[PDB]
Amino acid sequence: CDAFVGTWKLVSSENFDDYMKEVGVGFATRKVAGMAKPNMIISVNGDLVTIRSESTFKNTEISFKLGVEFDEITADDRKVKSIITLDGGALVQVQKWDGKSTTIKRKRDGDKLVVECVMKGVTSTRVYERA
Amino acid sequence: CDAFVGTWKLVSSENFDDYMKEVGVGFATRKVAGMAKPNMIISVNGDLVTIRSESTFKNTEISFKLGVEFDEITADDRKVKSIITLDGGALVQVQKWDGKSTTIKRKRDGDKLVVECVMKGVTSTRVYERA
Numbered sequence: 001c002d003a004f005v006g007t008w009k010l011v012s013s014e015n016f017d018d019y020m021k022e023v024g025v026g027f028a029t030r031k032v033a034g035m036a037k038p039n040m041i042i043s044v045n046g047d048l049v050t051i052r053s054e055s056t057f058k059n060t061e062i063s064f065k066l067g068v069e070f071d072e073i074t075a076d077d078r079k080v081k082s083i084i085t086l087d088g089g090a091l092v093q094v095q096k097w098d099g100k101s102t103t104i105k106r107k108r109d110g111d112k113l114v115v116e117c118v119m120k121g122v123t124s125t126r127v128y129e130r131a
Numbered sequence: 132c133d134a135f136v137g138t139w140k141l142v143s144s145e146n147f148d149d150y151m152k153e154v155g156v157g158f159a160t161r162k163v164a165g166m167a168k169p170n171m172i173i174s175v176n177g178d179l180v181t182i183r184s185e186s187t188f189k190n191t192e193i194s195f196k197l198g199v200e201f202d203e204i205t206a207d208d209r210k211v212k213s214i215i216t217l218d219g220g221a222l223v224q225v226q227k228w229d230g231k232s233t234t235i236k237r238k239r240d241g242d243k244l245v246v247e248c249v250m251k252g253v254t255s256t257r258v259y260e261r262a
Protein backbone atom coordinates (compact mmCIF):
# COMPACT_ATOMS: atom_id res chain seq x y z
CA CYS A 1 0.00 0.00 0.00
CA ASP A 2 3.10 2.17 0.38
CA ALA A 3 4.13 1.73 -3.26
CA PHE A 4 1.41 4.16 -4.37
CA VAL A 5 2.35 6.94 -1.94
CA GLY A 6 3.58 10.08 -3.67
CA THR A 7 2.71 12.87 -6.10
CA TRP A 8 2.07 11.69 -9.66
CA LYS A 9 1.32 13.70 -12.79
CA LEU A 10 -0.49 12.47 -15.90
CA VAL A 11 1.63 11.79 -18.98
CA SER A 12 -0.63 9.59 -21.10
CA SER A 13 -4.37 9.11 -21.70
CA GLU A 14 -6.09 6.64 -24.02
CA ASN A 15 -9.82 6.09 -24.58
CA PHE A 16 -10.70 8.47 -21.75
CA ASP A 17 -13.46 10.03 -23.86
CA ASP A 18 -15.01 6.62 -24.68
CA TYR A 19 -14.95 5.76 -20.97
CA MET A 20 -16.56 9.03 -19.83
CA LYS A 21 -19.22 8.55 -22.51
CA GLU A 22 -20.10 5.11 -21.11
CA VAL A 23 -20.42 6.36 -17.52
CA GLY A 24 -22.82 8.99 -18.88
CA VAL A 25 -20.76 12.22 -18.75
CA GLY A 26 -22.13 15.10 -20.82
CA PHE A 27 -20.67 16.12 -24.18
CA ALA A 28 -19.45 19.54 -23.02
CA THR A 29 -18.13 18.13 -19.76
CA ARG A 30 -16.24 15.33 -21.55
CA LYS A 31 -14.64 18.08 -23.62
CA VAL A 32 -13.17 20.12 -20.75
CA ALA A 33 -12.43 17.03 -18.63
CA GLY A 34 -10.31 15.49 -21.39
CA MET A 35 -8.29 18.69 -21.76
CA ALA A 36 -7.19 18.36 -18.14
CA LYS A 37 -3.87 16.87 -17.02
CA PRO A 38 -4.64 16.11 -13.34
CA ASN A 39 -2.18 15.40 -10.56
CA MET A 40 -2.87 12.43 -8.31
CA ILE A 41 -1.58 12.81 -4.74
CA ILE A 42 -1.69 9.66 -2.62
CA SER A 43 -1.03 9.66 1.11
CA VAL A 44 -1.49 7.43 4.16
CA ASN A 45 -2.07 8.18 7.86
CA GLY A 46 -2.35 5.03 9.92
CA ASP A 47 -5.15 2.99 8.37
CA LEU A 48 -6.53 5.91 6.37
CA VAL A 49 -5.59 6.36 2.71
CA THR A 50 -6.01 9.64 0.82
CA ILE A 51 -6.24 10.11 -2.93
CA ARG A 52 -6.28 13.78 -3.88
CA SER A 53 -6.74 14.79 -7.52
CA GLU A 54 -6.09 18.36 -8.70
CA SER A 55 -6.86 19.93 -12.07
CA THR A 56 -8.41 22.91 -13.87
CA PHE A 57 -11.63 20.92 -14.34
CA LYS A 58 -12.17 20.08 -10.65
CA ASN A 59 -10.36 19.17 -7.42
CA THR A 60 -11.38 16.01 -5.55
CA GLU A 61 -10.30 14.17 -2.41
CA ILE A 62 -11.34 10.84 -0.96
CA SER A 63 -10.12 9.39 2.33
CA PHE A 64 -10.86 5.72 2.98
CA LYS A 65 -9.93 2.53 4.79
CA LEU A 66 -9.09 -0.51 2.66
CA GLY A 67 -12.01 -2.87 2.16
CA VAL A 68 -14.55 -0.63 3.90
CA GLU A 69 -17.38 0.81 1.79
CA PHE A 70 -17.76 4.59 1.67
CA ASP A 71 -19.84 7.29 -0.04
CA GLU A 72 -18.25 9.25 -2.85
CA ILE A 73 -19.19 12.25 -4.98
CA THR A 74 -17.24 11.80 -8.20
CA ALA A 75 -15.86 14.75 -10.17
CA ASP A 76 -18.58 14.27 -12.80
CA ASP A 77 -21.11 14.53 -9.94
CA ARG A 78 -22.27 10.97 -9.39
CA LYS A 79 -23.22 9.90 -5.86
CA VAL A 80 -21.65 6.44 -5.74
CA LYS A 81 -20.85 3.75 -3.16
CA SER A 82 -17.15 2.89 -3.36
CA ILE A 83 -14.99 0.02 -2.12
CA ILE A 84 -11.19 -0.08 -2.56
CA THR A 85 -9.16 -3.27 -2.10
CA LEU A 86 -5.49 -4.24 -2.36
CA ASP A 87 -5.99 -6.92 -5.00
CA GLY A 88 -2.99 -8.61 -6.60
CA GLY A 89 -0.76 -5.77 -5.43
CA ALA A 90 -3.06 -3.24 -7.13
CA LEU A 91 -5.54 -0.83 -5.55
CA VAL A 92 -8.82 -1.87 -7.12
CA GLN A 93 -11.74 0.51 -6.74
CA VAL A 94 -15.31 -0.45 -7.55
CA GLN A 95 -18.04 2.20 -7.78
CA LYS A 96 -21.71 1.20 -7.69
CA TRP A 97 -24.59 3.57 -8.50
CA ASP A 98 -28.06 3.19 -10.07
CA GLY A 99 -27.66 -0.52 -10.83
CA LYS A 100 -24.50 0.30 -12.81
CA SER A 101 -20.87 -0.32 -11.85
CA THR A 102 -17.35 0.77 -12.82
CA THR A 103 -13.89 -0.46 -11.83
CA ILE A 104 -10.86 1.79 -11.43
CA LYS A 105 -7.64 -0.21 -11.11
CA ARG A 106 -4.47 1.63 -10.04
CA LYS A 107 -1.33 -0.49 -10.46
CA ARG A 108 2.44 -0.02 -10.44
CA ASP A 109 4.55 -0.90 -13.48
CA GLY A 110 8.18 0.09 -13.21
CA ASP A 111 8.65 3.83 -12.68
CA LYS A 112 5.02 4.57 -13.49
CA LEU A 113 1.48 4.27 -12.09
CA VAL A 114 -1.06 2.83 -14.52
CA VAL A 115 -4.76 3.62 -14.08
CA GLU A 116 -7.26 1.40 -15.90
CA CYS A 117 -10.91 2.51 -15.77
CA VAL A 118 -13.41 -0.02 -17.14
CA MET A 119 -17.14 0.15 -17.90
CA LYS A 120 -18.94 -2.43 -20.02
CA GLY A 121 -15.93 -3.59 -22.01
CA VAL A 122 -14.70 -0.04 -22.67
CA THR A 123 -11.28 0.48 -21.12
CA SER A 124 -9.37 3.70 -20.57
CA THR A 125 -5.67 3.73 -19.74
CA ARG A 126 -4.00 6.70 -18.07
CA VAL A 127 -0.29 6.57 -17.26
CA TYR A 128 1.11 8.61 -14.38
CA GLU A 129 4.71 9.48 -13.68
CA ARG A 130 5.95 10.72 -10.29
CA ALA A 131 6.25 14.51 -10.22
CA CYS B 132 -29.15 22.77 5.88
CA ASP B 133 -30.11 24.19 2.47
CA ALA B 134 -29.22 27.67 3.76
CA PHE B 135 -25.52 26.77 3.44
CA VAL B 136 -25.32 25.63 -0.19
CA GLY B 137 -23.22 27.78 -2.53
CA THR B 138 -19.72 29.11 -3.19
CA TRP B 139 -18.39 31.40 -0.46
CA LYS B 140 -15.45 33.83 -0.54
CA LEU B 141 -13.59 34.82 2.65
CA VAL B 142 -14.03 38.54 3.36
CA SER B 143 -12.81 38.80 6.93
CA SER B 144 -10.66 36.95 9.48
CA GLU B 145 -10.02 37.68 13.17
CA ASN B 146 -7.75 35.87 15.66
CA PHE B 147 -7.10 33.02 13.22
CA ASP B 148 -3.38 32.97 14.05
CA ASP B 149 -4.20 32.56 17.76
CA TYR B 150 -6.51 29.64 16.95
CA MET B 151 -3.89 27.86 14.82
CA LYS B 152 -1.25 28.50 17.50
CA GLU B 153 -3.54 26.66 19.93
CA VAL B 154 -4.35 23.68 17.69
CA GLY B 155 -0.60 23.17 17.33
CA VAL B 156 0.15 24.61 13.88
CA GLY B 157 3.78 25.41 13.18
CA PHE B 158 5.02 28.99 13.03
CA ALA B 159 6.07 28.62 9.39
CA THR B 160 2.97 26.91 7.97
CA ARG B 161 0.87 29.10 10.27
CA LYS B 162 1.94 32.23 8.39
CA VAL B 163 1.30 30.59 4.99
CA ALA B 164 -2.21 29.53 6.02
CA GLY B 165 -2.84 33.01 7.40
CA MET B 166 -2.31 34.59 3.97
CA ALA B 167 -4.81 32.32 2.20
CA LYS B 168 -8.33 33.46 1.26
CA PRO B 169 -10.22 30.11 1.06
CA ASN B 170 -13.32 29.45 -1.04
CA MET B 171 -15.74 27.28 0.91
CA ILE B 172 -18.09 25.45 -1.46
CA ILE B 173 -20.99 23.70 0.25
CA SER B 174 -23.20 21.28 -1.67
CA VAL B 175 -25.71 18.53 -0.95
CA ASN B 176 -26.63 15.34 -2.79
CA GLY B 177 -29.26 13.47 -0.84
CA ASP B 178 -28.17 12.77 2.73
CA LEU B 179 -24.54 13.57 1.83
CA VAL B 180 -23.19 17.04 2.58
CA THR B 181 -19.95 18.12 0.90
CA ILE B 182 -17.76 20.98 2.13
CA ARG B 183 -14.89 21.84 -0.21
CA SER B 184 -12.35 24.51 0.79
CA GLU B 185 -10.11 25.79 -2.01
CA SER B 186 -6.98 27.87 -1.42
CA THR B 187 -3.34 28.33 -2.36
CA PHE B 188 -2.31 26.76 0.97
CA LYS B 189 -4.26 23.52 0.46
CA ASN B 190 -7.38 22.15 -1.23
CA THR B 191 -9.52 20.05 1.13
CA GLU B 192 -12.86 18.25 0.81
CA ILE B 193 -15.10 16.40 3.25
CA SER B 194 -18.26 14.46 2.46
CA PHE B 195 -20.40 13.40 5.39
CA LYS B 196 -23.79 12.62 6.83
CA LEU B 197 -25.20 14.65 9.74
CA GLY B 198 -24.70 13.10 13.17
CA VAL B 199 -22.56 10.24 11.83
CA GLU B 200 -18.94 10.14 13.01
CA PHE B 201 -16.27 10.08 10.28
CA ASP B 202 -12.48 10.18 9.88
CA GLU B 203 -10.87 13.42 8.72
CA ILE B 204 -7.40 14.61 7.78
CA THR B 205 -7.40 18.35 8.37
CA ALA B 206 -5.69 21.00 6.25
CA ASP B 207 -2.85 21.07 8.79
CA ASP B 208 -2.62 17.28 8.50
CA ARG B 209 -4.22 16.20 11.77
CA LYS B 210 -5.95 12.81 11.80
CA VAL B 211 -9.19 13.59 13.65
CA LYS B 212 -12.65 12.05 14.23
CA SER B 213 -15.44 14.44 13.21
CA ILE B 214 -19.16 14.73 13.90
CA ILE B 215 -21.21 17.47 12.25
CA THR B 216 -24.71 18.22 13.51
CA LEU B 217 -27.42 20.82 12.99
CA ASP B 218 -27.52 22.41 16.44
CA GLY B 219 -29.53 25.58 16.94
CA GLY B 220 -29.81 26.16 13.19
CA ALA B 221 -26.01 26.16 12.86
CA LEU B 222 -23.73 23.50 11.37
CA VAL B 223 -21.65 22.57 14.42
CA GLN B 224 -18.52 20.51 13.84
CA VAL B 225 -16.53 18.78 16.57
CA GLN B 226 -13.08 17.36 15.76
CA LYS B 227 -11.35 15.02 18.27
CA TRP B 228 -7.69 13.95 18.31
CA ASP B 229 -5.26 12.80 21.01
CA GLY B 230 -7.58 13.70 23.89
CA LYS B 231 -7.97 17.16 22.36
CA SER B 232 -11.12 18.65 20.83
CA THR B 233 -12.07 21.77 18.89
CA THR B 234 -15.44 23.00 17.58
CA ILE B 235 -16.00 24.78 14.28
CA LYS B 236 -19.41 26.46 14.09
CA ARG B 237 -20.79 27.43 10.65
CA LYS B 238 -23.79 29.78 10.84
CA ARG B 239 -25.80 32.17 8.65
CA ASP B 240 -25.96 35.78 9.84
CA GLY B 241 -28.00 37.59 7.23
CA ASP B 242 -26.38 37.65 3.80
CA LYS B 243 -23.16 36.25 5.25
CA LEU B 244 -21.75 32.92 6.51
CA VAL B 245 -19.95 33.18 9.85
CA VAL B 246 -17.51 30.54 11.06
CA GLU B 247 -16.46 30.38 14.71
CA CYS B 248 -13.45 28.16 15.46
CA VAL B 249 -12.92 27.53 19.17
CA MET B 250 -10.04 25.71 20.90
CA LYS B 251 -9.88 25.94 24.70
CA GLY B 252 -10.75 29.59 25.26
CA VAL B 253 -9.48 31.24 22.07
CA THR B 254 -12.07 31.91 19.37
CA SER B 255 -11.40 32.72 15.71
CA THR B 256 -14.06 34.29 13.49
CA ARG B 257 -14.00 34.09 9.70
CA VAL B 258 -16.88 35.60 7.76
CA TYR B 259 -17.73 34.56 4.23
CA GLU B 260 -19.84 36.06 1.48
CA ARG B 261 -21.47 34.50 -1.60
CA ALA B 262 -19.04 34.40 -4.52
Ligand SMILES: O=S(=O)(O)c1cccc2cccc(Nc3ccccc3)c12
Pocket residue numbers: 020023025033036038053055057058074075076115117126
Ligand atom coordinates in the same frame (compact mmCIF):
# COMPACT_ATOMS: atom_id res chain seq x y z
O1 LIG C 1 -10.97 13.66 -12.40
S1 LIG C 1 -11.11 13.52 -13.84
O2 LIG C 1 -10.07 12.72 -14.45
O3 LIG C 1 -11.19 14.82 -14.49
C1 LIG C 1 -12.69 12.68 -14.19
C2 LIG C 1 -13.54 13.47 -14.96
C3 LIG C 1 -14.82 13.05 -15.36
C4 LIG C 1 -15.27 11.83 -15.00
C5 LIG C 1 -14.49 10.94 -14.22
C6 LIG C 1 -15.04 9.67 -13.88
C7 LIG C 1 -14.34 8.78 -13.13
C8 LIG C 1 -13.06 9.10 -12.68
C9 LIG C 1 -12.44 10.32 -12.95
N1 LIG C 1 -11.15 10.51 -12.43
C10 LIG C 1 -9.97 9.87 -12.82
C11 LIG C 1 -8.73 10.48 -12.53
C12 LIG C 1 -7.54 9.90 -12.89
C13 LIG C 1 -7.51 8.70 -13.56
C14 LIG C 1 -8.71 8.06 -13.87
C15 LIG C 1 -9.93 8.62 -13.51
C16 LIG C 1 -13.14 11.33 -13.76
Ligand SMILES: O=S(=O)(O)c1cccc2cccc(Nc3ccccc3)c12
Pocket residue numbers: 151154156164167169184186188189205206207235246248257
Ligand atom coordinates in the same frame (compact mmCIF):
# COMPACT_ATOMS: atom_id res chain seq x y z
O1 LIG D 1 -8.15 25.56 5.46
S1 LIG D 1 -7.47 26.61 6.22
O2 LIG D 1 -8.34 27.74 6.52
O3 LIG D 1 -6.28 27.08 5.50
C1 LIG D 1 -6.88 25.93 7.83
C2 LIG D 1 -5.51 26.03 7.96
C3 LIG D 1 -4.80 25.59 9.09
C4 LIG D 1 -5.47 25.03 10.12
C5 LIG D 1 -6.87 24.87 10.10
C6 LIG D 1 -7.49 24.27 11.23
C7 LIG D 1 -8.82 24.09 11.28
C8 LIG D 1 -9.62 24.49 10.21
C9 LIG D 1 -9.11 25.09 9.06
N1 LIG D 1 -10.02 25.44 8.05
C10 LIG D 1 -10.96 26.48 8.07
C11 LIG D 1 -11.29 27.10 6.84
C12 LIG D 1 -12.20 28.12 6.79
C13 LIG D 1 -12.82 28.57 7.92
C14 LIG D 1 -12.52 27.99 9.15
C15 LIG D 1 -11.60 26.95 9.24
C16 LIG D 1 -7.66 25.31 8.95
Ligand SMILES: [Cl-]
Pocket residue numbers: 110111
Ligand atom coordinates in the same frame (compact mmCIF):
# COMPACT_ATOMS: atom_id res chain seq x y z
CL1 LIG E 1 9.31 3.98 -8.02
